[PDB]
Design a protein around this ligand. Structure first.
Ligand SMILES: [Ca+2]
Ligand SMILES: [Ca+2]
Ligand SMILES: [Ca+2]
Length: 149
């Protein structure tokens, strides 16, 4: 009920290759982050383990929209012996030309995930090589970061 918006992405894991693929599909219902009434959203993806940010990716920026479509794919190298102990963090931010780009909200999937986040990750693991798309509710960074730290 924090009213930040939602993000849709797919997950795919290939155990033999250790290839983890995340496709950022779209976000909707995003919080307004600029005085014009809109936002300029882009998405960051972090691969994490044990409180440490290991790798990062980011999408292009969409201007002046609360319902951006991306369709941008990213891949990480995670060995099968480690895939159950990592997190994938997905953050939507508002781009501002000057000043800190503030997060709208974020979610993570993987180790220590719960609810729909755990469901998505478990679905990915249960179906090697198969891409699984799912919606997630964005959550305030204060709360998500406390779980990741
Ligand atoms: Ca702003
Ligand atoms: Ca703008
Ligand atoms: Ca902006």
């Amino acid at each position: 009920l924090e009213k930040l918006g939602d993000i849709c992405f797919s997950l795919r894991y290939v155990p033999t290759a250790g290839k983890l693929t995340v496709v950022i599909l779209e976000a909707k219902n995003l919080k307004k982050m600029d005085v014009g009434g809109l936002s300029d959203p882009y998405v960051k993806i972090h691969l994490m383990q044990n409180g440490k940010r290991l790798k990062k990716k980011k999408t292009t920026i969409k201007k002046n929209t609360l319902n951006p479509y991306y369709n941008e794919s990213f891949s990480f190298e995670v060995p099968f012996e480690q895939i159950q102990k990592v997190q994938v963090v997905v953050t939507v931010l508002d781009y501002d030309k000057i000043g800190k780009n503030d997060a709208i909200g974020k979610v993570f999937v993987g180790y220590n995930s719960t609810g729909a986040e755990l469901r998505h990750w478990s679905d990915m693991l249960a179906n090697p090589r198969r891409p699984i798309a799912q919606w997630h509710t964005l959550q305030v960074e204060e709360e998500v970061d406390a779980m990741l730290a």
